Amino acid sequence: KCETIHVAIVCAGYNASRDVVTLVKSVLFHRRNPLHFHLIADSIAEQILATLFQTWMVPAVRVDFYNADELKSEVSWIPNKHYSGIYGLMKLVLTKTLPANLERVIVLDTDITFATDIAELWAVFHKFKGQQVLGLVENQSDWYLGPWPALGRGYNTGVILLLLDKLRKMKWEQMWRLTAERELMGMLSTSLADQDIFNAVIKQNPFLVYQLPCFWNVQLQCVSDLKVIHWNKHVEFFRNLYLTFLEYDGNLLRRELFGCPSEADVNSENLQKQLSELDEDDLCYEFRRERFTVHRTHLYFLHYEYEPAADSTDVTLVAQLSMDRLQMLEAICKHWEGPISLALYLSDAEAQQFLRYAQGSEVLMSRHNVGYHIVYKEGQFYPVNLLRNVAMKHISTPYMFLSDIDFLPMYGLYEYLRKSVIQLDLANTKKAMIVPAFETLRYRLSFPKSKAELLSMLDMGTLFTFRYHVWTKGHAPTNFAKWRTATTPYRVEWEADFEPYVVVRRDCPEYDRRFVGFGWNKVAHIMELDVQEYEFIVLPNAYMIHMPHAPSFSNKQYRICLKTLKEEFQQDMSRRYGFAALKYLTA
Amino acid sequence: KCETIHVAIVCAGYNASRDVVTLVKSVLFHRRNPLHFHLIADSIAEQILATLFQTWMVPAVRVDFYNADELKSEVSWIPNKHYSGIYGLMKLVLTKTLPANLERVIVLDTDITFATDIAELWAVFHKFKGQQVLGLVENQSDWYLGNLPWPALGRGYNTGVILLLLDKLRKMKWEQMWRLTAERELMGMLSTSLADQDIFNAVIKQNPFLVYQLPCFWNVQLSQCVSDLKVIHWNKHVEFFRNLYLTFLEYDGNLLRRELFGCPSEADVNSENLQKQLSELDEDDLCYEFRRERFTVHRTHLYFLHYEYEPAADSTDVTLVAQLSMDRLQMLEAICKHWEGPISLALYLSDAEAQQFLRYAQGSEVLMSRHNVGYHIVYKEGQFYPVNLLRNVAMKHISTPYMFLSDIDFLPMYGLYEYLRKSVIQLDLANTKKAMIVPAFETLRYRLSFPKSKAELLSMLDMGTLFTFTNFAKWRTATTPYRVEWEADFEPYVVVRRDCPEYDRRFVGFGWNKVAHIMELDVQEYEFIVLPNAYMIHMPHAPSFDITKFNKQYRICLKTLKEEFQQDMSRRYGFAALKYLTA
Ligand SMILES: *[C@@H]1O[C@H](CO)[C@@H](O)[C@H](O)[C@H]1NC(C)=O
Ligand SMILES: *[C@@H]1O[C@H](CO)[C@@H](O)[C@H](O)[C@H]1NC(C)=O
Ligand SMILES: [Mn+2]
Ligand SMILES: [Mn+2]
C-alpha cells in the first residue's frame, strides 16, 4: 500500500554526512513509498543532516534523530581495532533506542547504494518464518573461512533487516550481550566490530537468521539482478551509478507522489502559504518567489576543526562564491590565516567537482578552520543575501569580517583585526570596523607588503580605489585622502549608497532576502547597521585588494523590479523603525 | 520472452532528433526485451541519428533507417497548412515501407515519453480481435467535437501512439482504403488541419470496426486520468510531469549501455573493434588509461540545434572551428559578434549540461538569430579531456571548403571572415597545399577595448596592454603574406583545406596535440603562410579543471605519447621524418 518504510542509519562526522546524502539520493530515485529515516547520529552529523533535510523538503519523508553519543555507554565495553567501530556496535542496540511501536526496520551503512525500489527489500520481511528475526546477506569475502567464529562463510552487516517486535520478545539484549561476553573471554578484540558479534550470535543461534540473496548486498558476483551495492569489469558500470548519484540534482527529488498522502513538514506549509499570498499578475513574481525560496543546504561539507582562542577576539573571514571563483580559495588561504566561512552556491555536479579539487589541494587540506557550506542552485537569480546569511550564521568566533571572495586581504590582516577589536573596545561598544577597499585591473605577481607600497602603487595608476571608475560614491565616505596619512582609527558617518567592508560582532543584523539577484543589498545592510547606531571606524593600517574577474551571467523590467524592491525596503523600514528611517529616504 | 519489440518513428529535422533521443532514453530505462527501431527520417535526421546510434552502442538494439524524402510523393497530394505535416502523413504508408516479414509494430511520435516497460503495450496486441488492426487512444482535446474540423468518430483518436497489425493491414488492402477516404473527404474540406490524424479519424469514421481503443493512460495528452500512467504525450499539477521529463533529460545516456540481463545480443562491430583494441593493450603499463582512452567511443549528437547553411557563390567559404566545455559557454556570443560566417563547435557535455545549454541558447537572441552554427555534443566519458576527438568531431562536420582551426578563448578580429576568403583566393589555396597562419595575441585586462585595425593593435602592443600569445618586426611592417618554416614545437593557428590531416587521437589530455598536428602538415608539405592583416586575441578567463589534473605520472605519460608519435611517424614516412626528431 502506501505503508511507510523505516530505515535506520548510524552516521557520525562529515564524511558520513556526505555519504548518507548519496545513499538517500539512491533510495529516493527508485522509491514509490513514504520513507522514515531514523538517523543515529553524533552531534556533527545531527547538525549537518538536520539542516540538510529541513531545507531539502522531500515530500513523504520523515527524519528522526537519535543522539549517538548517549549510546556509547551501551557498547563501549566491547573493544575494537578502530575507535569508529563503536558506531558499528550501536546497531546491536537499535531495539532499545528505536520507538516501541516500530515493528520492523531496515538498517543500512553509509556506503550502501540502492539500484532498485526499496519496497522489494522491505517486502522480503514477509517471507520470514518462526524464530527468524534477522535478515542478512552472506559475507561474500572469505574472511571467516581463513578470526571470530561464524556460521559457514558468515554474514555481512552492511544491510540488516530487523523484526523489532520479535527481537524485543526474545530479549535480544541479554542474548547478544551474553554471546559477546562469552566470546570476548577468548577472542581479545573484534576486528570487524558489530559484524563479528552478529555472526557469533547467529553461530550460537542459527535459527535467528534469514539469508538474503546475494543481490541485496553486492559487496565490491552473481547488472539487472544486482540491486544494492556495498563499497569498500562490471565495476565501471556501478562506479558510474555512484558518480551519477553523487552528481544528480537533489532538487529533482522534491517530486511529490500521489496515491499516498504527503506530509509538508512545517517549512513546506509556510512556503506554500507565501507562494499563495503572492500576486501572479505582478511582473516581479520571480523576485517575490525567490524572496521565499528554500535551497538545499549542506553545512560543513568538508572536515572542520576550530581551536578555541585564548582571547574573545577571534575573527572569521566571511564570503560567498559560485564555481567560477574557485580559483580564489587558495589565494585567500595564503593571505588570511584565521578561520574562514564560505557559502558556495553550486550544482550537485559542481559540488563533487569542488570535493575533488579541495581534496587535491595541499593548502585546502592543511586548513581545518574553513567551513564550506553548500547552497544548491535553484531558480533564476543568484541569492547573494541568502548565501551571505548562511555563511555568517555558521561561524565559530565572536567577530566576523564581511568580505568578498574576490578580495585578497592584506598580509597579516587577521592578527591586525584582533589587535583592533582590542584597541577600539569592540567588546563593550557597538562598532563596525572598515577595511579600505582597493582594486587592480589585472593579476599581479608582487602583492603590496606595506601601506607604503600600496600608496606608491596607487600614485602610479597600477592600483586604484575600489569601483573608482564606476561608483566613486559607496567608498568615497571612507575618505582615502585622510586614510593615506592617518595613524589613528577615525570615525566616518553614513552617506547614501555607502557600501564599505566591515568587521562586526557576530550577532549583528542579517541581510534582507527580498533583494535577490544583483542590486542594492549591501547598501540596505549598511543602512540597517546605521539605524542601530553602529559606529563606522576606518582602520589606519588595514587594506584589501579586489582581483579582476569576468562578469557573471540587464533587462529593463529587472531594473524596474529592483527599484520597486528598493522602494518596498524603505517602506518596510519606515514602518519597522520609525522617525529614524526618514534621514535615509531624503538621500 | 526475449522476443524483439519493433518501434517505428517518423522523424525529420533537428528538434525531432533531440526529442527522439529523449524518447529512446525513456524506453531503454524500462525495457527488458531486445528492441528494433525503424526510423523513417529526412536526410538531417538520418545523419544525426545514424551517428548517435553508432556511437551509443546500446546492446540488444537494432536500428534501420528508411529515407523519408523518397516517400514524399506518396502523400504530397494531400495539402496541409504546415509543410512539416507531410512527415506526419507518412505514417499512413508504413504497411508499404516497413519490411514484408514484419507482422506488427508500435508507432510513436517524437514527443512521447515512456514511464513503463514497453513490453506491456506490446502485449496489448494479444487482446486484438477479429477485423481490428489499429490500436489508438482517444483524443483528449475537444478538437473534433466543436469549433475551436474533419470528420471523426466521437472524440476522434490521438495518433501519437499507434499499434499496427501489419499483416492484416496488408491483407485488407489498407493503402487503397485510406487513399479512398482521403480523396472523398478532401473534395469537401479543402485542406487538412492536423494531417495524418485527420485521415486516420476519417477512416475510423468510415470503418469503425478497425480500431481497438487503448486506455487513456497509454497516451496521456498533456496540453485527469500517478502510478497508473505509462506513456506521456507532450504538447500546478504540471510540476510532477515536467520533473519526469527533466529526469529523463538529465539521465546519463552511457548507463543505458548496460547489457540485457536475459538475452545475448551482438553489439554490431563497433564494440567488436573496441573490445579487440582494449584487449591488445598492456595493462601493466602505467599509461594504460591514456591508451584505453585513445579508442573510447563517445556518444555523439551532431547538430543539436537548428542549422541552416547558405551555399556560397564562390568556392571560398571558411568555417571557424573550435571546442569547449560548459565553463566556456560565455564565449559563444562574443565569437558570434566577431565572426559572422559559419561555425562548427564540439561541446564536451553531460546530459544535464546539454539540457542547460539548450536552455541557454533558447534564451539568447544572438544565438537564436544565427542559424549557421553547428553545435555537436560529445558526451563525457572517461578520465581525460579528449581534446583531439573534440577537434576532429568539430572539423569533420563543416559545410565549407576551408576551415579556421581556432580556440574558444580567442576573439578573431572584426572582419576576419572576409579577409580569409580574400586570402584563399590570393594565395591560390584551391590549387596548392597551404596553411595560412593567423597571428595570436593575448591580454590580461578583463575590460578591454577591442582594436578595430592593425594600427590600433600595434599601439596597444606598444602600451603593454596586449602581448604575444618569429620576427614580430616582419609582421609588424609586412604588407604581403610571407612564408615561414617549421620549427621545433611549432604551434600556430592555421586556416586550411577541409581535407587536411586530422588530429591524432592518441593525445588525450593537454600536451603535444597541436604540435603533432602541425608536424603532420609539415611532412605532407603544406606551406605555412602568415597573413599580414589577420589577428585574434586571447581573453582572460577563470581556469577550468585541467588545473586539477596536471600528477607527475601525467607529465611522464604525455611525454611518452609524444615519443610514440614521433616513432610511428618515423615508421610511416621515413627519412623526411628525421628532421623533426633532430629538434
Ligand atoms: C574523511 O575524508 C577526508 C577527505 O575527504 C579524509 O582526509 C579524512 O581522513 C576522512 N576521515 C576519516 C577517514 O575518518
Ligand atoms: C525548434 O525548437 C526550438 C526550441 O529550442 C524552437 O525555438 C524552434 O522554433 C523550433 N523550430 C521548429 C521548426 O520547430
Ligand atoms: Mn565584484
Ligand atoms: Mn585557453
Q: Is A441 helix (H, G, I), strand (E, B) or coil?
A: coil
User: What letter would DSSP give residue A213?
Assistant: P
Q: In the sheet that B220-221 helps form, which strands lie side by side, from edge to edge?
A: B112-114, B231-233, B220-221
Q: Which residues of B touch A353 (CB under 8 A)?
A: 545
> Other CB atoms closer than 10 Å to residue A79's CB: what's the count?
13
Distance, CA of B220 to CA of A465 (rounded, Å): 61
- Asked if residues A204 and A177 have their Cβ atoms less than 8 Å apart, the reply is no
Q: Locate all alpha helices (DSSP H) within B233-312, ordered by sequence.
A: 238-249, 270-280, 288-294
Amino acid (one-letter) located at A538: V
Q: Distance (Å, rounded) from C-alpha B182 to C-alpha B184? A: 6
In SS3 terms, A334-403 reads as HHCCCCEEEEEEECHHHHHHHHHHHHCCHHHHHCCCEEEEEEECCCCCCCHHHHHHHHHHCCCCCEEEEC
Q: From residue B468, how far is each of A548, B27, B410 by CA, in Å? A: 21, 53, 13
Measure the CA dihedral B37/B41/B47/B51, to 10°. -10
Q: What does the block give as the cell for A437?
A: 577597499
Cell 523538503 maps to which residue? Answer: A57
Write out the three cell numbers for A10. 548510524
Q: Which three cell numbers stand for residue A310?
A: 585564548
What ligand has the least distance to the C-alpha of A360? Answer: 1
Rounded to whole angstroms, the Cα distance separating A423 from A434 reads 14
Please return the burial class of B302, using the count of CB atoms within 10 Å of its CB with bins 0-12, 13-18 and 19+.
buried
Cα dist from B460 to B103, B437, B445, B449, B471, whole Å: 73, 21, 12, 10, 18
Cβ neighbours of residue B450 closer than 8 Å, sequence gap 6 or more: B411, B414, B537
DSSP B245: H
Closest to A9 in 3D by CA, of A162, A138, A135: A162
Return the number of other C-beta atoms located less than 10 Å from residue B369's C-beta: 8
Report CA torsion sign: B325, B327, B328, B331: positive
- Dihedral of the CA atoms B94, B95, B96, B101 (nearest 10)? 120
- Identify the three-state secondary structure at position A460: coil
Reported as type and span, the H/E element at residue B434 is: strand B434-437
* Amino acid, res. B141: S
Partners of residue A443 in chain B, C-beta under 8 Å: 444
Q: Which amino acid, B185?
A: E
Is the CB–ligand 1 distance for residue A15 below 6 Å?
yes
* Alpha-helical segments (H) within B251-385: 270-280, 288-294, 331-338, 351-362, 365-369
Q: What is the DSSP letter of A520?
A: S
Identify the bridge partners of residue A463 per DSSP, sorted by sequence position: A440
Residue B15 Cα to ligand 2 middle (Å)? 6
Beta carbons of B390 and B302 less than 8 angstroms apart: no
Question: Judging by beta carbons within 10 Å of its beta carbon (0-12, 13-18, 19+), is residue B28 exposed, middle or buried?
Answer: buried
Residues of A in contact with B261 (CB under 8 A): 223-225
Distance CA A228, CA A23 (A): 10
Query: How open is the CA angle A394-A398-A403, to the nearest 5 degrees?
Result: 65
Query: d(Cα A482, Cα B361) in Å, to the nearest integer?
Result: 50
C-alpha distance across the termini of chain B, in Å: 65
CB environment B213-223: b (16+ within 10 A), e (fewer)? ebebebbbbee
Domain hosting residue B16, numbered range: 5-253
Cβ of A303 closer than 6 Å to ligand 1, yes or no, is yes
Count CA within 13 A, CB hemisphere, residue A555: 12
Closest among A209, A141, A198, A152 to A175, alpha carbons compared: A198
Q: At what angle do helices B238-249 and B351-362 cross, to 10 degrees?
A: 120
Task: For residue A329, give the C-alpha cell.
Answer: 580559495
Query: Cell 573461512 identifies what position?
Result: A145
Interstrand relation of A112-114 and B343-349 (parallel, antiparallel or unpaired): unpaired
What Å distances lie between residue A565 and A281, A514, B355, CA to CA? 17, 7, 32
B536-538 sheet: strands from edge to edge: B410-412, B536-538, B440-443, B466-468
Which residues have C-beta within 8 Å of that of residue B245, sequence separation ≥ 6?
B22, B113, B232, B234
Q: What angle do CA A266, A269, A273 make, to 5 degrees?
A: 145
Name the residue in chain B with its Cα closest to that of A549: B446
| DSSP summary character for residue B252 | -
- Compute the distance between CA of residue B413 and CA of residue A339 in angstroms, rounded to an integer: 47
Q: How far apart are CA B441 and CA B439, in angstroms?
A: 7
Of B499, B510, B507, the C-alpha closest to B562 is B507
For residue B427, what is its C-alpha cell?
594565395
Q: What share of chain B is helix, strand, coil (3-state, %, to 5)?
A: 40, 20, 40
Contact predicate A545/A526, CB 8 Å: no
**H/E run at residue B300:** strand B300-301
Q: B448 exposed, middle or buried (CB, 10 Å; 0-12, 13-18, 19+)?
A: middle
Q: Which chain A residues touch B if contact means CB-CB below 8 Å?
A: 32, 223-225, 237, 240-241, 244, 247-249, 252, 254-259, 323-327, 347, 349, 353, 356-357, 360, 441-443, 548-550
Angle, alpha carbons A469-A472-A476 (nearest 5°)? 145
- Which ligand 2 atom lies nearest to the CA of residue B361? 5
CB B49 within 8 A of CB B11: yes
Mutation target among B25, B545, B552 for the A interface, most CBs of A within 10 A: B545
Atom of ligand 2 nearest to the CA of B15: 1
- Helices A13-30 & A234-246, crossing angle to 10 degrees? 100
Grid cell at residue B152: 471523426
Give yes or no for a contact between A376 and A301, defined as CB atoms under 8 angstroms apart.
no
Paired with A465 in beta bridges are: A438
Asked whether A437 and A522 are in contact (CB, 8 A), the reply is no
CB contact under 8 A, B446 and A255: no
CA A445 to chain centre: 34
What is the C-alpha separation between B466 and B445, in angstroms, rounded? 9
Report the CATH number that the domain containing residue A182 is assigned in CATH: 3.90.550.10
3-class secondary structure, A8 = strand
User: Could you give phi then psi for residue A543, rounded to 5 degrees?
Assistant: -170, 160
Q: Mark residue B303 as left, alpha or beta (left: phi above 0; alpha: psi -120 to 50; beta: remaining).
A: left
Backbone breaks in chain B (C–N > 2.5 Å) follow which residues? Answer: 148, 223, 225, 235, 469, 550
Q: How many C-beta neighbours within 10 Å does residue A541 have?
A: 17
Task: Name residues whose C-beta falls within 8 Å of residue B403's C-beta, 6 or more positions apart in sequence.
Answer: B318, B319, B321, B344, B395, B495, B496, B497, B498, B500
Q: CA-CA distance, A367 to A307, in Å (whole number)?
A: 12
Nearest CA of chain A to the CA of B548: how many Å? 6
- Expt. technique: X-ray
For residue A151, the SS3 value is coil
Whether the CB-CB separation of B203 and B173 falls below 8 Å is answered with no
* Contact criterion met (CB below 8 Å) for A80 and A184: no
By C-alpha distance, the chain B residue nearest A257 is B226
Name the nearest CA neighbour of B330 among A62, A182, A323, A344: A323
- The 3-class secondary structure across A462-478, one letter per residue, is CEEECCCCCCCCCCHHH
Strand, helix or coil for residue A408: strand
Interface A-B: count of C-beta contacts within 8 A: 74
Q: Is the dihedral of CA B461, B463, B467, B471 positive or negative?
A: positive
Query: Is residue B570 within 6 Å of ligand 2 at its C-beta?
Result: no
Helices A285-292 and A267-277 cross at an angle (nearest 10°) of 160
Q: Tell me which residue has cell 573493544.
A: A79
For residue B252, say whether it is annotated as part of any ligand binding site: no
